[PDB]
Amino acid sequence: AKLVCYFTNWAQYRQGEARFLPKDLDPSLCTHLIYAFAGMTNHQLSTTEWNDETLYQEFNGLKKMNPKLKTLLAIGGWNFGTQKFTDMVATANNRQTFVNSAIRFLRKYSFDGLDLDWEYPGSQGSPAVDKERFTTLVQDLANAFQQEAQTSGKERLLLSAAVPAGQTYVDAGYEVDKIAQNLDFVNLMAYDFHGSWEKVTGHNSPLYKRQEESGAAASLNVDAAVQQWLQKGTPASKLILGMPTYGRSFTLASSSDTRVGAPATGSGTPGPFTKEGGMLAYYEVCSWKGATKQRIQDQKVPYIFRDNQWVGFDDVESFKTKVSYLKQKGLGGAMVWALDLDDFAGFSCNQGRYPLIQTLRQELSLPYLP
Numbered sequence: 001a002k003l004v005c006y007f008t009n010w011a012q013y014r015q016g017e018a019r020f021l022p023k024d025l026d027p028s029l030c031t032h033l034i035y036a037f038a039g040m041t042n043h044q045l046s047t048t049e050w051n052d053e054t055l056y057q058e059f060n061g062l063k064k065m066n067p068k069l070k071t072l073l074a075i076g077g078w079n080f081g082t083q084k085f086t087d088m089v090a091t092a093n094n095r096q097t098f099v100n101s102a103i104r105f106l107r108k109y110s111f112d113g114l115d116l117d118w119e120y121p122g123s124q125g126s127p128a129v130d131k132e133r134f135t136t137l138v139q140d141l142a143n144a145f146q147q148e149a150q151t152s153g154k155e156r157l158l159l160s161a162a163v164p165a166g167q168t169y170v171d172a173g174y175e176v177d178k179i180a181q182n183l184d185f186v187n188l189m190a191y192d193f194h195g196s197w198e199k200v201t202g203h204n205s206p207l208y209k210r211q212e213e214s215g216a217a218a219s220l221n222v223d224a225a226v227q228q229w230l231q232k233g234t235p236a237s238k239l240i241l242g243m244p245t246y247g248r249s250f251t252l253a254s255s256s257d258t259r260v261g262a263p264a265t266g267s268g269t270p271g272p273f274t275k276e277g278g279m280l281a282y283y284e285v286c287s288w289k290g291a292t293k294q295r296i297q298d299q300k301v302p303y304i305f306r307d308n309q310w311v312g313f314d315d316v317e318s319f320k321t322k323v324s325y326l327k328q329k330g331l332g333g334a335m336v337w338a339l340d341l342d343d344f345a346g347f348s349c350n351q352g353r354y355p356l357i358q359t360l361r362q363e364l365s366l367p368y369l370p
């Protein structure tokens with residue numbers, strides 16, 4: 001089984017005990033660490049933070065402590081948008097420029113592979129032609145990684161992709177059966193199912209549908225998303241189930257209606273550390289004074305509220321339920337967004353360091369590597 005964990009290169013700017021920096025990485029917590037994010041300049045892979053080269057050295061230096069750890073660099077992300085991806089895949093020459101730059105870049109900084117986080121081909125402004133061009137880009141990278149392994153005699157660079165769970169995004173940009181053959185593994189973003197872009201409360205990452213749901217809404221859950229990618233042609237062993245160590249927050253229309261599906265007026269108040277309206281880290285909801293925790297019986301996940309603030313999140317119990325689920329399905333493992341949103345320092349939840357990700361590790365019965 002795999003435990004794929006995302007590091008974010010902006011967590012270093014959080015204040016106080018929420019600041020995430022080199023020393024906070026555990027070299028044996030996960031099997032694969034993915035560095036978010038790289039960017040693109042003139043169709044070539046490039047850094048996005050002033051000290052990325054310093055962090056790369058720290059990041060990939062973990063492999064000196066755990067030689068079996070694999071590291072990947074993720075390009076893209078939500079805020080990156082789509083225009084640079086669209087321009088790069090528009091021509092064979094631009095794709096070749098990108099592919100060659102990626103191989104040199106990964107080898108130079110000692111990454112073991114590349115994680116494609118284009119969000120998304122065919123959506124977020126990207127034209128419909130990008131669906132097939134994304135298939136071609138995945139093929140170009142896979143084939144070029146294979147060729148580089150042969151000419152260099154080194155171990156082949158890995159290729160993964162972070163993929164959406166909602167059907168409108170999948171059908172707009174993903175030839176699932178084709179790309180699954182060329183990807184080493186598929187990181188299913190089984191979160192952001194609901195959020196403050198909607199006018200009623202809903203859970204970030206529900207495992208199952210609610211009984212009252214219908215239509216397209218009844219597919220906005222983990223089980224439906226997994227079945228979607230499996231039925232569309234992803235081998236179970238390549239499908240890695242994403243897990244959130246954060247929640248999605250709402251400002252309720254009235255403190256007297258705290259139901260799942262209650263009217264919301266907008267995003268929840270920004271957290272004291274993450275400072276991003278609409279989301280909260282696990283350590284910002286696990287010891288929230290005065291709040292009331294609840295569980296969604298149909299969906300097997302908690303929510304919590306205080307006054308006009310409503311947050312759906314994941315706890316140790318829901319992570320355990322989700323792992324038991326993935327095991328029943330025969331999936332390749334779990335993926336986590338993100339290291340810095342768990343209680344990585346153990347300063348808030350009184351559950352030790354990395355309580356959520358240690359739960360995944362234990363439930364997946366991953367080997368204790370020295």
Ligand SMILES: C[C@H](NC(=O)c1cc2c(=O)[n+]3ccccc3[nH]c2[n+](Cc2ccccc2)c1N)c1ccccc1
Pocket residue numbers: 078079192195196197246267277278279337
């Ligand atoms: C990776 C993850 N997710 C986003 O980065 C993100 C994902 C969506 C989204 O799926 N999504 C789906 C459907 C419709 C809109 C929408 N918008 C999104 N916004 C923008 C956004 C807008 C309004 C309120 C909150 C967030 C986002 N930043 C994340 C990153 C950092 C910290 C926690 C979690």
